[PDB]
RNA sequence: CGUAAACCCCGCCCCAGUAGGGAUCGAGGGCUGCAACUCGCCCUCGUGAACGUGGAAUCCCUAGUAACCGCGUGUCACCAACG
RNA sequence: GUUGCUACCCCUCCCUACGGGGAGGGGGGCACACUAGGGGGACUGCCGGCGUAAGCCGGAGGAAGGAGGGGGCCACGGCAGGUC
RNA sequence: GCGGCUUAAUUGGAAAACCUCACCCGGG
């Protein structure tokens, strides 16, 4: 679903990264 | 001696770029020296449409109205 | 030589004689270009010959093959295979095609199924949407 | 024989810059370049 | 700079030209006027517009090109990207091979970009736009 | 009756007026003689095989023929 | 009349007093000394441009195939160096379904130039040059406002603008003739150039230049 | 180049008067001395400062 | 002419159903390219004809206020129109159209049912196939 | 002299004529008149010799791209189609593999094509036939195009 | 994955609502899935609607750009006319 | 220069107008091209004109010329803007 | 895609058959 929360909206499975596409901009660096 | 290939139109020589004019500035003003025919000695300021460089020969369909406002 | 026959009746249809054999045969309401090309090749007739100048011996084979394509082509080439009432592979043509297809629509209507009700209602019967283009400014049923 | 610069592995994640899609469609290019030698 | 002598004596030259994404490597030795692009003869190139573009360096040099075999190794960049790349490499190779300055003058009068090349490549599609739209 | 679909009275005519023109194309015959350009093509190609015309410029659709 | 120098590749042909200027070199032969043929068939050498202002912007530099990469639009007056026959090819890539198909337009002009030569017995490059002289307008009209209603007013057209207008009318004249009728595009383009070269009103280009100059005379 | 901002202009002026005898009227020599006479971790700014400091020498030598 | 009404008829007038709003009316006018529409109900019963002038005048009268800045198709149709049977002549048809002040004339059969409508444009066209020789100075406004 | 010294259209026509007249193994099958050469093809092929032309085309492709096999030749005979709804944009479709597979099988019986682990390559007899037809065209070809004389008949 | 399409060459079509168009509909064959009717996607045969270049109005774009062409990928068990 | 490139070789096969050509396998090599790190290059620098001068216009050379081309970073303060 | 209309529901804001789901009917 996600990794830093559970949200299901923008799950992302590119490569093996499981993030909600909102957290990922905050945990990208 | 004969420059204009046409019959009604008399050729003219661009000798000085004066400035733009017209609505939205698509007309640029030019110092033209009249080539072969009547007004051989006259130097006219006309309005030219399109890009006109220094040294361009343009053809003048008439050679009496100088005219430049195009407000 | 022989003047080109302007009119040729094959399979109960006034086919043109100035068209080639393959593309003139597609005017029949159950024969199209793929079917018309197969009939010409299968019967040995050149599909790009002029149908007007053909001899009558081949016109009958065109007339027989158009009405009995199910004895020439494979089963996967006919417009009624595994027939919903007789179970036999058929290629209906013309008025039997209109009747055969029409007895499938009214069966849905005389049943009140989903596709029957949308056929009675004059609307799209496959998965589509009418919040949209939806409504037809053109004809729905053309067969 | 020596060092050799194998071509780098580039990783892209183009992400929409909006937590609810209000406004212009602005996108975020996130990059993680990997170099390999030998 | 684009040219580099390979073996001299039986003068062998390797030239290079590029256009967009096409790269042409041409190896010139002193034979007759055979020109083989990727093994195919240049007079047997199917796409006519691309063929004439390649042959223009050979046409401008009247009889000098008849004294060298030319083999061209092209790849990438579509039928015209390769024709311009092959045309570049042949023109660079011809001027460098025979050491003919006058050919260099004529090759630039016809087309100044014949030896300079093409710097411009492409423009990346930006996000939120249909294309580059630059 | 060479070219089966066209009568010899017409085909002999088109064979004649092509010899007086400096260049002919299938469209020019088809408008002037009221025939399909498809039928106007095999007329020209029949004459080129005859030897009266030489193909001087070919392309999809139009072909240019010169009478020689 | 100039004090700002001039780029090389230019040439002045001082006649009486007038400085006629050509931006393209007519003089190019092979290393052997052979002439260069457009499409391998037609010769640039006998071609003359009868019009003085248009002598500067028609590039009769001998090329085999008119294919410049599109590298002359960056600078103002960079269109003087694009060969004139390639300008015709560049205007055949319309409408939007034909944009970028230069090989198609190359074949259309090439086949058209063959039809021009046999139907006329004249140099195909030359007849096209006389098409432009018989087509390019010498007067135009402009917008003007007098407090709510936009009137017109006559002006002169610069020699670069005349070439852009003669060429556009020829290609758009032929393109409309080929739409929704059996006539092929090469036949349309060949007849359009031959008509306008002969100054026939039937051509689209001669009609267009007549209407624009007729309108200008009213709105002096 | 359109206009040189202050940090080009302030940097170039100070470097001239500290070492007034180490700058000639050619860009090539002036590019070398500026890179050694100033902390310049930017290729563009070094060239811009070197080009400008070429120009004071002309006006100063044009003055006399 | 000697021409009767049935020659100049328009049989399949474009139709809108009675509960179509006015935006549909403008779109229907655009698609049909006709100067007249015929409106019918849920039962396929024609009740009236909406002409371009009636729609424009209705829009002008209804939507007119700008100093004070701060439906369905059935409401616009007219059930009552000039009518002529199938054997009607162009002269009487033009007289009826003029007297009633309509753009058209609805033809009613013997049984009493519409089959076609003829408006100003088909009258001008019928003049084109038959009409007499007159200079325009005696017809110009 | 070699396959690259003659135009493909001339070579393909000559090869298809030879296979139709001198190789009895290559034969159009029973389902030939009822099929198109791929999934979303609009119409069947027009020329009645289309089976032999495909064989003549396939052998020339095996000369240049030897160890290919069936799954790569389908991409070589792909086309732009309307996959799915006919009002969607166009995609690329691979040609039908039953035709390509059978012609490769038929050519192998004639002794012109052999299989490998990486594809189907031309046998030495197959290369001889392709090159012998090529040399035949080149003899007549040079007479109209003398400029090709330096590629097949060096002075 | 992968020998991309546009493009080039050759042959048929010839101004017609057509060998343009491919909506709609009938018969049949398959794939994913626990499941395909409402409500999925692919193929075959047949059927061939509007449409003949679009009113007032209105959008984008300055060079390898506009336009055209395909390909990869995100979403994803399956499916992209979307990014 | 474990990977990528093929001028240079040798073996095969094929064609051969008879000289040669072409495709495959291997060797040798990094030459070319390619990959990837560092560095250089462009500065209105030179020439003509104008300008006190900031700088502007033309030209030459130049791979590249006027901020070389494309993009990132979003100043204070707002939009009782969008997102429980 | 949104609005309106209809609806038991057509969900709520300014890559949908299950799950998603936030809505309706029946049940835990
Ligand atoms: Mg759907
Ligand atoms: Mg692009
Ligand atoms: Mg039409
Ligand atoms: Mg498309
Ligand atoms: Mg793919
Ligand atoms: Mg039709
Ligand atoms: Mg079609
Ligand atoms: Mg079914
Ligand atoms: Mg279903
Ligand atoms: Mg079908
Ligand atoms: Mg219509
Ligand atoms: Mg439109
Ligand atoms: Mg995936
Ligand atoms: Zn999250």
Which residues fall within 8 angstroms of residue I84, CB to CB, at 6 or more apart?
A: I5, I92, I93, I96, I105, I107, I108
| Best CA proximity match to E13, nearest among E85, E86, E69 | E69
Query: In a 10 Å sphere around its CB, with 0-12 CB exposed, 13-18 middle and 19+ buried, how is residue A27 labelled?
Result: exposed
**DSSP conformation letters of B32-69:** EEE-SSTTTT-EEEEEEES---TT-EEEES-SS-----
G71 to chain E: which residues are within 8 Å by CB? 113, 118
The pair of structure tokens assigned to G74 is: 């960056």
CA-based nearest residue to J51, from J112, J96, J7: J96
DSSP state of E20: T
Residue in J67, J94, J68, J66 with CA at minimum distance from that of residue J79: J94
Q: Is A6 helix (H, G, I), strand (E, B) or coil?
A: coil
> φ, ψ for residue D26 (rounded to 5)?
-100, 135
Secondary structure (3-state) at G38: strand
Cβ pair J28, C41 in contact under 8 A: no
What distance in Å separates the CA atoms of residue G55 and residue G22, rounded to the nearest whole number? 6
Which tokens go with I133?
């020789």
Q: Across the strands, what pairs with E5?
A: E13
d(CA J77, CA F36): 34
The residue among E98, E91, E110 whose CA lies nearest residue E18 is: E91
Q: Do at least 3 CB pairs under 8 Å connect J with B? A: no
Distance in angstroms: CA I130, C1' K47? 44
Dihedral sign from CA coordinates of F31, F35, F39, F44: negative
- Yes or no: say if G28 and E110 are a contact pair by the CB < 8 Å rule: yes
**Bridging pattern class, strands E13-19 and E4-5:** antiparallel
Print burial letters for I1-35: b (CB count within 10 Å at least 16), e (below 16): eeebbeebebeebeebebebebeebeebbeeeebe
| In the block, residue with structure tokens 């004019």 | B21
| Ligand closest in space to the Cα of A8 | 14
Residue J40's closest CA among J84, J104, J88, J103? J84
Helix axes H43-63, H6-18, angle to 10 degrees: 60
C4 touches chain F (CB under 8 A): yes
* Smallest Cα distance from D10 to chain E, Å: 16
Count CB atoms within 10 A of the CB of residue F17: 13
CA distance I9 to I26: 24
Q: How far is the CA of G98 from the C1' of K20 (A)?
A: 18
Rounded CA gap, J18 and J53, in Å? Answer: 10
With CA atoms as reference, report the closest residue to I1 among I103, I120, I84, I125: I125
- Contact (CB, 8 A) for I90 and I1: yes
Q: Judge whether G111 and G186 are in contact, CB under 8 Å.
A: yes
SS3 per residue for chain I:
CCCECCCCCECCCCEEECCCCHHHHHHHHHHHCCCEEEEECCCCCEEEEEEHHHHHHHHHHHCCCCCCCCCCHHHCCECCCCEECCCCEHHHHHHHHHHHCCCEEEEECCCCCEEEEEEHHHHHHHHHHHCCCCCHHHCCC
- Closest to I16 measured CA to CA, from I62, I71, I105, I77: I77
Listed in sequence order, the residues at least 6 apart from D14 whose beta carbon sits closer than 8 Å to its beta carbon are: D27, D28, D29, D30, E127
Residue A5 to residues A8, A10, G195, Cα–Cα distance (Å): 9, 12, 77
Closest residue on chain C to F3 (Cα): C1
Tell me the C-alpha distance between J136 and J55, whole Å: 19
Dist. CA J19–CA J51, nearest whole Å: 10
Chain F CB within 8 Å of residue C53 CB: yes
In contact, C125 and C118? CB cutoff 8 Å: yes
Q: Which among C23, C26, C35, C37 is the top mutation candidate for probing chain J, defined by the most J β-carbons within 10 Å of its own β-carbon?
A: C37
State the Cα angle at I134 between I130 and I135, rounded to 5°: 135
Among all chains, which residue has been given the structure tokens 């890539």?
G93
> Cα separation of E78 and G100, whole Å?
13
Using CB atoms within 10 Å of the CB of residue F51, give its burial: 0 to 12 exposed, 13 to 18 middle, 19+ buried: exposed
| Burial class (CB within 10 angstroms; exposed 0-12, middle 13-18, buried 19+) of J18 | middle
- Cβ burial, residue F48 (10 Å; 0-12/13-18/19+): middle
CA-to-C1' distance for J66 and L22, Å? 14
**Which letter does DSSP use for residue A19 in this model?**
-
Is C20 in contact with C50 (CB distance < 8 Å)?
A: yes
CA distance E122 to E20: 8
Judged by DSSP in three states, B18 sits in strand
Q: What's the rounded Cα separation, in Å, for the pair G38 and B60?
A: 34
> Is residue F2 within 8 Å of residue F49, measured between CB atoms?
no
Count H helices and E strands in chain A, helices first: 1, 0
State the resolution, in angstroms.
2.5
**Residue from I95, I102, I101 nearest I117 by CA:** I102
Determine contact, residues G133/G196, Cβ cutoff 8 Å: no
Are G47 and G24 contacting, i.e. CB atoms less than 8 angstroms apart?
no
Question: Which chains are within 8 Å of B by 3+ CB pairs?
Answer: G
Q: What is the rounded CA–CA span in Å between residue E88 and residue E110?
A: 13
Cα–Cα distance, G150 to B40 (Å, whole number): 35
Give chain I's length: 141
The residues, ordered by sequence, that sit 6+ positions from C85 with a Cβ below 8 Å of its Cβ are: none
Q: Count CB atoms within 10 A of the CB of residue G119.
A: 18
Q: Which of chain C's residues have a Cβ under 8 Å away from the Cβ of J44? A: 33-34, 37-38
Beta bridge partners of D29: D14
Q: DSSP of E27-70, one letter per residue? A: EEESSSS-EEETTEEGGG-SSHHHHHHHHHHHHHSSSGGGG-EE
Rounded distance between C-alpha atoms, residue I85 and residue I108, angstroms: 5
Separation of alpha carbons C11 and C96, rounded Å: 12
Q: Which of G84, G218, G203, G65 is nearest to G135 (CA)?
A: G203
CB contact under 8 A, A17 and D11: no
Q: Hey, CA dihedral for C19, C23, C25, C28, is it positive or negative?
A: negative
How many angstroms separate the CA atoms of C60 and C68, rounded? Answer: 12
* Tokens 């019928």 found at: I126
Show residues of chain C in contact with F2, CB under 8 Å: none
Bond before G95 cis per omega within 30 degrees: yes
Q: Both tokens of residue I74?
A: 């059935």
Nearest to E117 by CA among E46, E18, E51, E48: E18
The answer to whether E115 touches E104, Cβ cutoff 8 Å, is yes
E-F interface (Cβ pairs under 8 Å ≥ 3): no
CA I53 to ligand 12 centroid distance, Å: 27
Phi-psi category of residue J30: left, alpha or beta, with phi > 0 → left and psi -120 to 50 → alpha: alpha
Protein residue closest to L31, using CA and C1'? E6
* Main-chain phi, psi angles of E19, to 5 degrees: -155, 120
Distances (CA, A) of G72 to B29, G82, H4: 26, 7, 31
**B17-22 — which CB contacts under 8 Å span 24+ positions?**
B17/B52, B17/B54, B18/B45, B18/B68, B21/B47, B21/B68, B21/B69, B21/B70, B22/B47, B22/B70, B22/G142, B22/G143, B22/G144
Q: E68 Cβ partners below 8 Å, 6+ apart?
A: E28, E29, E30, E31, E33, E94, E97
Q: CA J42, CA J36: separation in Å to the nearest integer?
A: 8
Residue G97's region, left for phi above 0, alpha for psi from -120 to 50, else beta, is alpha
- CB C13: neighbour CB atoms within 10 A? 17
Is C6 near chain F, with CB under 8 Å?
no
Residue I118 gets the label, from left (phi > 0), alpha (psi -120 to 50) or beta, of beta
d(C-alpha G81, C-alpha G23), whole Å? 7
Q: Is G143 on the interface with B (CB under 8 A)?
A: yes
Say which DSSP state G151 is in.
E
Closest CA to H6 of H64, H44, H45: H45
CA angle E26, E27, E31 (to 5 degrees): 125
Q: DSSP state, C90?
A: B
Pairing of strands E22-29, E4-5: unpaired
User: Rounded to the nearest 10 degrees, what angle do helices I120-130 and I90-100 cross at?
Assistant: 150
B11:G53 CB<8 A: yes
CB of G52 within 8 Å of any CB in chain F?
A: no
G21-22 and G37-38: which strand pairing?
Answer: unpaired
Query: With 0-12 CB in 10 A as exposed, 13-18 as middle and 19+ as buried, what is I137?
Result: exposed
J96: DSSP letter: P
- What are the backbone dihedrals phi and psi of residue F55, each rounded to the nearest 5 degrees, phi first? -70, 125
Please report residues of G whose CB lies closer than 8 A to that of E118.
69, 71
Cα A17 to ligand 13 centre (Å): 14
Q: How deeply is J108 buried, as exposed, middle or buried, from its count of CB atoms within 10 A (0-12, 13-18, 19+)?
A: middle
Q: E130 CA to middle of ligand 12, Å?
A: 19
Tokens 């071609």 belong to which residue?
G47
Closest by CA to C47, choosing from C59, C55, C39, is C39
| Residue J18 parent element (H or E) | helix J8-22
Cβ pair C80, C91 in contact under 8 A? yes
Which own/partner pairs from I101-109 qualify as long-range (CB within 8 Å, at least 24 positions apart)? I102/I51, I103/I35, I103/I36, I103/I51, I103/I52, I103/I53, I104/I36, I104/I49, I104/I51, I105/I81, I106/I49, I106/I81, I106/I82, I107/I5, I107/I6, I107/I9, I107/I83, I108/I83, I108/I84, I109/I85
Task: Please give the structure tokens belonging to residue G104.
Answer: 């198609």
How distant, in Å, are the alpha carbons of C96, E27, E36, F58, J4 from that of E73?
Answer: 65, 9, 9, 32, 15
> In this structure, what DSSP letter does residue J24 have?
T
Q: CA-CA distance, F17 to F9, in Å (whole number)?
A: 13
Q: Is residue C98 classed as helix, strand or coil in its secondary structure?
A: helix
Calpha distance E80→E74 (Å, rounded):
11
């Amino acid at each position: 679903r996600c990794l830093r929360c559970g949200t299901r909206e923008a799950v992302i499975r590119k490569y093996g990264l499981y993030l909600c596409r909102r957290c990922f901009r905050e945990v990208a660096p | 001696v004969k420059f204009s290939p046409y019959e009604d139109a008399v050729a003219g020589l661009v000798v000085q770029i004066l400035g733009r004019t017209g609505v939205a500035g698509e007309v640029t003003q030019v110092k033209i020296r009249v080539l072969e025919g009547r007004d051989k000695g006259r130097v006219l300021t006309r309005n030219v449409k399109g890009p006109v460089r220094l040294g361009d020969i343009v053809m003048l369909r008439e050679t009496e109205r100088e005219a430049r406002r195009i407000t | 030589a022989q003047e080109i026959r302007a009119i040729v009746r094959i399979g109960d249809t006034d086919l043109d004689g100035n068209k080639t054999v393959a593309y003139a045969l597609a005017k029949i309401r159950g024969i199209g270009i793929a079917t018309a090309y197969a009939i010409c090749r299968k019967l040995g007739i050149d599909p790009h010959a002029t149908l007007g100048l053909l001899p009558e011996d081949q016109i009958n084979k065109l007339d027989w093959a158009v009405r009995n394509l199910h004895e020439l082509a494979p089963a996967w080439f006919l417009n009624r295979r595994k027939d919903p009432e007789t179970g036999r592979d058929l290629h209906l043509i013309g008025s039997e095609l209109v009747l055969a297809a029409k007895r499938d629509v009214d069966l849905m209507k005389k049943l009140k199924s989903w596709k029957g009700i949308r056929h009675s209602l004059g609307l799209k019967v496959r998965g589509q949407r009418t919040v949209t283009t939806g409504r037809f400014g053109a004809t729905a049923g053309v067969t | 024989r020596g060092p050799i610069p194998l071509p780098t592995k580039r990783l892209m994640v183009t992400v929409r810059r909006a937590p609810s899609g209000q406004g212009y469609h602005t996108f975020d290019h996130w990059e993680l370049r990997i170099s390999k030698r030998l | 700079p684009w040219v580099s002598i390979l073996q001299e004596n039986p003068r062998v030259i390797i030239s290079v030209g590029k256009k967009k994404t096409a790269v042409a490597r041409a190896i010139i030795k002193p034979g007759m006027g055979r020109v083989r692009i990727n093994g195919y003869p240049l007079e047997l190139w199917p796409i006519e517009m691309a063929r004439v573009k390649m042959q223009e360096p050979l046409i401008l040099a009247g009889d000098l090109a008849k004294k060298v075999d030319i083999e061209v190794n092209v790849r990438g960049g579509g039928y015209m990207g390769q024709a311009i790349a092959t045309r570049i490499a042949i023109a660079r190779g011809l001027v460098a091979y025979f050491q003919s300055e006058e050919l260099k003058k004529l090759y630039e009068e016809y087309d100044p970009y014949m030896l300079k090349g093409d710097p411009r490549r492409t423009e990346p599609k930006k996000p939120g736009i249909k294309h580059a739209r630059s | 009756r060479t070219i089966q679909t066209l009568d010899e009275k017409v085909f002999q005519t088109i064979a004649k007026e092509v010899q007086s023109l400096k260049a002919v194309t299938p469209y020019e015959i088809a408008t002037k003689y009221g025939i399909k350009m498809s039928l106007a093509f095999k007329v020209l190609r029949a004459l080129r095989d005859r030897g009266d015309l030489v193909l001087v410029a070919k392309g999809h659709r139009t072909e240019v023929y010169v009478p020689k | 009349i100039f004090g700002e120098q001039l780029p090389k590749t230019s040439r002045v042909e001082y006649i009486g007093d007038v400085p006629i200027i050509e931006e393209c070199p007519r003089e190019l032969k092979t290393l052997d000394g052979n002439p260069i043929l457009l499409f391998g068939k037609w010769s640039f050498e006998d071609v003359v441009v009868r019009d003085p202002g248009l002598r500067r912007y028609i590039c009769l530099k001998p090329v085999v195939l008119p294919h410049t990469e599109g590298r002359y639009q960056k600078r103002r007056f960079g269109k003087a160096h694009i060969p004139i026959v390639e300008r015709l090819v560049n205007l055949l890539m319309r409408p939007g379904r034909n944009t970028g198909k230069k090989h198609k337009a190359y074949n259309i002009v090439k086949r058209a130039f063959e039809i021009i030569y046999y139907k006329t017995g004249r140099n195909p490059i030359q007849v096209f040059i006389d098409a432009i002289i018989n087509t390019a307008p010498r007067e135009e009209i402009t917008r003007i406002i007098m407090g709510g209603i936009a009137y017109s007013v006559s002006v002169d057209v610069s020699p670069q603008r005349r070439l852009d207008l003669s060429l556009r009318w020829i290609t758009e004249g032929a393109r409309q003739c080929s739409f929704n009728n059996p006539k092929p595009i090469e036949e349309c383009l060949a007849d359009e150039i031959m008509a306008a070269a002969a100054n026939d009103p039937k051509s689209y280009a001669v009609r267009k230049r007549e209407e624009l100059e007729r309108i200008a005379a009213a709105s002096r | 180049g359109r206009v040189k901002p202050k940090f080009i202009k302030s940097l170039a002026e100070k470097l001239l008067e500290a070492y007034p005898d180490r700058f000639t009227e050619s860009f090539k020599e002036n590019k070398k001395a500026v890179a050694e006479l100033a902390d310049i971790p930017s290729k563009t700014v070094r060239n811009k400062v070197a080009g400008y400091i070429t120009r004071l020498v002309k006006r100063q030598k044009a003055k006399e | 002419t000697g021409l009767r009404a049935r020659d100049v008829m328009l049989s399949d007038v474009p139709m809108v159903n009675v509960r179509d709003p006015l935006s549909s009316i403008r779109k229907a006018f655009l698609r049909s390219k006709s100067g007249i529409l015929a409106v019918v109900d849920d039962s396929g019963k024609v009740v009236g004809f909406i002409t371009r002038r009636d729609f424009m005048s209705y829009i002008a009268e209804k939507s007119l206020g700008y100093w004070r800045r701060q439906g369905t198709a059935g409401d616009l149709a007219k059930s009552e129109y000039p009518t002529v049977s199938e054997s009607a002549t162009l002269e009487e048809v033009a007289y009826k159209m003029l007297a009633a002040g309509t753009d058209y004339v609805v033809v009613i059969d013997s049984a009493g049912q519409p089959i076609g409508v003829v408006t100003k444009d088909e009258l001008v066209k019928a003049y084109k196939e038959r009409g007499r020789s007159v200079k325009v100075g005696e017809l110009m406004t | 002299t070699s396959v690259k010294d003659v135009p493909a259209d001339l070579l393909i026509a000559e090869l298809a004529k030879y296979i139709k007249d001198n190789v009895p193994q290559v034969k159009p099958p029973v389902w030939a008149p009822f099929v198109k050469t791929g999934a979303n093809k609009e119409r069947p092929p027009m020329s009645e010799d289309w089976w032999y032309i495909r064989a003549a085309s396939i052998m020339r492709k095996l000369y240049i791209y030897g160890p290919v096999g069936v799954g790569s030749l389908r991409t070589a005979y792909g086309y732009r189609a309307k996959i799915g709804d006919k009002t969607r944009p166009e995609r690329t479709r691979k040609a039908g593999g039953a035709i390509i597979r059978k012609i490769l099988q038929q050519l192998e019986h004639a002794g012109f094509v052999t299989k490998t682990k990486r594809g189907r390559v031309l046998t030495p007899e197959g290369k001889s036939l392709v090159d012998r037809v090529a040399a035949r065209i080149a003899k007549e070809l040079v007479k109209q195009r003398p400029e090709l004389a330096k590629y097949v008949a060096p002075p």
